[PDB]
Design a protein around this ligand. Structure first.
Ligand SMILES: *[C@@H]1O[C@H](CO[C@@H]2O[C@@H](C)[C@@H](O)[C@@H](O)[C@@H]2O)[C@@H](O[C@@H]2O[C@H](CO)[C@@H](O)[C@H](O)[C@H]2NC(C)=O)[C@H](O)[C@H]1NC(C)=O
Ligand code: MAN
Ligand code: MAN
Ligand code: CA
Ligand code: CA
Ligand code: CA
Ligand code: CA
Ligand code: CA
Ligand code: CA
Ligand code: CA
Ligand code: CA
Ligand code: CA
Length: 424
């Protein structure tokens, strides 16, 4: 049983083996003996010269086609002579050359990884396939140098190899949502009398899409905000536009605002908070004389799973306006004054109050008319009405004295009160 070898991809007419010689047959007797190829073992890849006994390549041999990824490739030829009958078997071994690169099944790979994946986690890649065999097949994978991912490769047999990405450090979608790298696969070309083989290489783009986790908590730029507003500010008045930022994606990053449970029942009445905009506004009557300040406790919380609430406090200081007029109150009024009352004779006592504060609560007083009475004051806001001259029971019998109390706000407010006095 003769044994020959032939490189795949040799051109037509290449020498394969001298069958006549290696069997001891003189070429001069070949024709007489009916030197011929057995019918079943004919192959389009081999020509046998029957006059010389020499085997030549006929059609070029592609090992990948006849033998796929088999580790061994052997064409079986059989020849025979007649008179006597003699049958000879011939095995022709086809040697693989490195005429194919590793190849990926698609030019762009995409791998999706949660930004909360732990370092050490592995993500499989689509493997490249190299149709050559043995050392000419796939040998290793490589990735663009980078600090986030390395490669792990293992043997699958039949010259195949499988790679995974190995996560080397945490990802942060909020810092970079997509990583792009170049993936490469090289075979092992670089042995039964073969000429030098060169290494071949295949390529694929690799896209890492980083999936969002709800790992950012909404954030107010301050823990307390202070706002001053005039009392009687009308409903709808803006207090403050809160903003609790959240860089996450989707519902993870959508923030809704509401009142914390610690909020006073009065603040809940007087203020209203837009759940989606964070707009805080007045919805009731702010009355300084009721309270100069309110504490609004707000919470913000995103709409994702495992959301964590954030908190801030709005201090609403109320500013006093001049919305109360002075109050006059008489404590004693002698309706009758004697005719000859000397000047300075006291006729009435009274006091004034104003529910406002500062200038808005400061009161000045005047006596109206051209009557012969004068105002005196011993202490702030306490007054007396005295006479100023002698009198007359008939010319001036009864007198109406009216006091006007005026505060010092803008616009000012004033009040009046009258008393009836008569000469005995
Ligand atoms: C609420 O704030 C956002 C974001 O503001 C930026 O990021 C914060 C962390 C903080 O550092 C701010 O000072 C930053 O300006 C506002 O939206 C952004 O506004 C900036 C300019 O103000 C603009 O350049 C960006 O493109 C905006 N981006 C987005 C996604 O909106 C937003 O307008 C604020 N809302 C209100 C009601 O004030
Ligand atoms: C294929 O190409 C790679 C580079 O992309 C080489 O490293 C390799 O030797 C082969 O030439
Ligand atoms: C695939 O394509 C890349 C281009 O980035 C080469 O480096 C590689 O050798 C193969 O040709
Ligand atoms: Ca081939
Ligand atoms: Ca080959
Ligand atoms: Ca190859
Ligand atoms: Ca993150
Ligand atoms: Ca969030
Ligand atoms: Ca996130
Ligand atoms: Ca008031
Ligand atoms: Ca007031
Ligand atoms: Ca007042």
């Amino acid at each position: 049983q003769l044994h020959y070898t032939v490189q795949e991809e040799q051109e037509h007419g290449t020498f394969v083996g001298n069958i006549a010689e290696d069997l001891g047959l003189d070429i001069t007797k070949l024709s007489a003996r009916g030197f011929q190829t057995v019918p079943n073992s004919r192959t389009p890849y081999l020509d046998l010269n029957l006059e010389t006994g020499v085997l030549y390549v006929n059609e070029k041999i592609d090992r990948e086609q006849i033998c796929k990824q088999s580790p061994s490739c052997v064409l079986h030829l059989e020849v025979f002579l007649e008179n006597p009958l003699e049958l000879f078997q011939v095995e022709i071994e086809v040697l693989d050359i490195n005429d194919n690169p590793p190849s990926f099944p698609e030019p762009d790979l995409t791998v999706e990884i949660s930004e909360s994946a732990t370092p050490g986690t592995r993500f499989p890649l689509e493997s490249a396939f190299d149709p050559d065999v043995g050392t000419n097949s796939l040998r290793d994978y490589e990735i663009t140098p980078n600090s986030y991912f390395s490669l792990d490769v293992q043997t699958q047999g039949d010259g195949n190899r499988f790679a995974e990405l190995v996560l080397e450090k945490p990802l942060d979608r909020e810092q970079q949502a997509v990583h792009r790298y170049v993936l490469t696969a090289v075979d092992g070309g670089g042995g039964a009398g073969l000429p030098p083989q060169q290494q071949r290489t295949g390529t694929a783009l690799l896209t890492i899409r980083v999936l969002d986790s709800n790992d950012n908590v909404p954030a107010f730029d301050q823990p307390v905000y202070t706002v001053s507003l005039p009392e009687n500010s009308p409903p709808g008045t803006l207090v403050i536009q809160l903003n609790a930022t959240d860089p996450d994606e989707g519902q993870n990053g959508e923030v809704v605002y509401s009142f914390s449970s610690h909020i006073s029942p009065r603040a809940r009445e007087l203020f209203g908070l837009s759940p989606r905009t964070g707009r805080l506004e007045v919805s009731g009557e702010l009355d300084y004389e009721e309270s100069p300040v309110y504490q609004v406790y707000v919470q913000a919380k995103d709409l994702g799973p495992n959301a964590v609430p954030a908190h801030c406090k709005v201090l609403v200081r109320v500013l006093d306006a001049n919305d109360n007029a002075p109050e006059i109150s008489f404590s004693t009024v002698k309706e009758a004054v004697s005719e000859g009352a000397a000047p300075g004779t006291v006729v009435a006592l009274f006091s004034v109050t104003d529910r406002d504060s500062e200038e808005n609560g400061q009161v000045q007083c005047e006596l109206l008319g051209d009557v012969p009475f004068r105002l005196k004051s011993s202490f702030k806001n306490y007054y007396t009405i005295v006479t100023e001259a002698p009198l007359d029971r008939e010319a001036g019998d009864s007198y109406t004295l009216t006091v006007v109390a005026r505060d010092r706000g803008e616009p000012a407010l004033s009040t009046s009160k009258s008393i009836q006095v008569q000469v005995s």
